Amino acid sequence: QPHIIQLKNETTYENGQVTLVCDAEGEPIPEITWKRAVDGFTFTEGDKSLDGRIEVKGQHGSSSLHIKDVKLSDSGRYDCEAASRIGGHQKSMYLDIEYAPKFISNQTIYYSWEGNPINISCDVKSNPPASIHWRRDKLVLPAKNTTNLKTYSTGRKMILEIAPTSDNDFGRYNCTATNHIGTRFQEYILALADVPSSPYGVKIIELSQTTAKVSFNKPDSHGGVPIHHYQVDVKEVASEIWKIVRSHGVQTMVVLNNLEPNTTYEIRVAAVNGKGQGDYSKIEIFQTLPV
Numbered sequence: 001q002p003h004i005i006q007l008k009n010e011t012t013y014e015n016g017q018v019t020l021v022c023d024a025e026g027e028p029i030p031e032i033t034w035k036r037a038v039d040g041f042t043f044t045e046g047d048k049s050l051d052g053r054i055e056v057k058g059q060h061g062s063s064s065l066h067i068k069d070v071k072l073s074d075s076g077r078y079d080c081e082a083a084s085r086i087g088g089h090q091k092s093m094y095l096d097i098e099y100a101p102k103f104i105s106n107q108t109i110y111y112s113w114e115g116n117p118i119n120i121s122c123d124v125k126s127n128p129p130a131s132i133h134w135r136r137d138k139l140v141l142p143a144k145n146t147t148n149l150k151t152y153s154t155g156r157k158m159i160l161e162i163a164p165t166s167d168n169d170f171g172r173y174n175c176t177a178t179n180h181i182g183t184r185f186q187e188y189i190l191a192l193a194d195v196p197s198s199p200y201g202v203k204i205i206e207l208s209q210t211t212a213k214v215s216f217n218k219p220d221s222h223g224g225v226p227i228h229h230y231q232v233d234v235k236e237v238a239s240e241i242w243k244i245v246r247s248h249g250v251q252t253m254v255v256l257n258n259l260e261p262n263t264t265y266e267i268r269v270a271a272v273n274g275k276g277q278g279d280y281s282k283i284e285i286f287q288t289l290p291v
């Protein structure tokens with residue numbers, strides 16, 4: 001002895017309550033300790049709680065771990081440790097947490113020109129797995145009287161393809177997700193755009209006394225908004241005149257020449273298309289090598 005004789009898996013739901021029970025036989029009657037596996041955190045009777053949601057009751061033979069206001073983060077493995085002096089045994093169970101679908105896309109606002117294709121991505125996490133639909137108003141998509149809309153489904157993701165856009169395609173879209181816990185929705189926006197968005201993540205990746213290579217990320221319109229070229233502006237920090245270098249088409253690296261050694265420069269990048277020039281990236285500072 002001792003021997004854990006009860007430690008059931010449990011399934012609960014977000015915002016609900018669950019009680020985990022562990023029973024152990026043995027002589028002497030063993031002390032029971034709870035361990036949350038993801039972070040190795042220990043629970044014992046009395047040992048309070050920070051957020052208050054979690055308490056343990058009973059210490060010998062049987063112990064209850066009570067969690068109120070269940071969070072998704074409470075999901076996973078919990079360990080029960082039964083120990084007497086003789087005197088050791090551990091067992092795991094898993095807490096399965098169910099919940100209404102949640103929308104987890106990084107982007108809900110999309111931009112496109114007239115006449116361009118664009119995919120709008122609806123990303124859903126739910127337990128159990130949800131059914132996802134796209135809708136415009138009350139109409140499920142694609143409608144029967146359209147020839148420019150398609151959907152593509154992959155478990156946690158449903159893509160709405162609009163190819164190409166016409167003006168009436170702009171506006172609000174409604175992505176709905178449903179499981180036995182509930183139905184939830186998330187609105188997405190497709191807006192008619194003109195100039196490119198701001199480039200970002202600009203870095204100096206090569207650097208000498210008189211030259212530097214700047215590299216950046218294109219603004220991702222997901223193909224809605226064209227980029228013709230980039231304008232790279234460079235300026236010595238106590239100088240007034242921005243020197244402009246155009247990129248070779250849609251290349252996202254540009255080599256800067258004719259720099260002074262040991263000199264501090266500001267650099268900013270903007271994308272340009274047929275409708276004009278977008279915002280500049282956040283200004284970055286570099287300093288050429290000394291002689």
Ligand SMILES: *[C@@H]1O[C@H](CO)[C@@H](O)[C@H](O)[C@H]1NC(C)=O
Pocket residue numbers: 007008009092093094
């Ligand atoms: C508990 O759940 C896990 C999977 O999450 C499973 O492997 C195991 O058989 C289940 N039963 C118990 C009581 O451990």
Ligand SMILES: *[C@@H]1O[C@H](CO)[C@@H](O)[C@H](O)[C@H]1NC(C)=O
Pocket residue numbers: 117118119152159161163222223
């Ligand atoms: C939209 O997604 C589909 C499915 O993966 C893909 O075939 C298509 O090329 C994408 N279109 C756009 C607008 O990028």
Ligand SMILES: *[C@@H]1O[C@H](CO)[C@@H](O)[C@H](O)[C@H]1NC(C)=O
Pocket residue numbers: 135137174175176185187
């Ligand atoms: C999205 O669709 C769902 C299900 O039809 C609906 O209940 C919800 O109100 C819609 N959202 C909006 C604002 O249209």
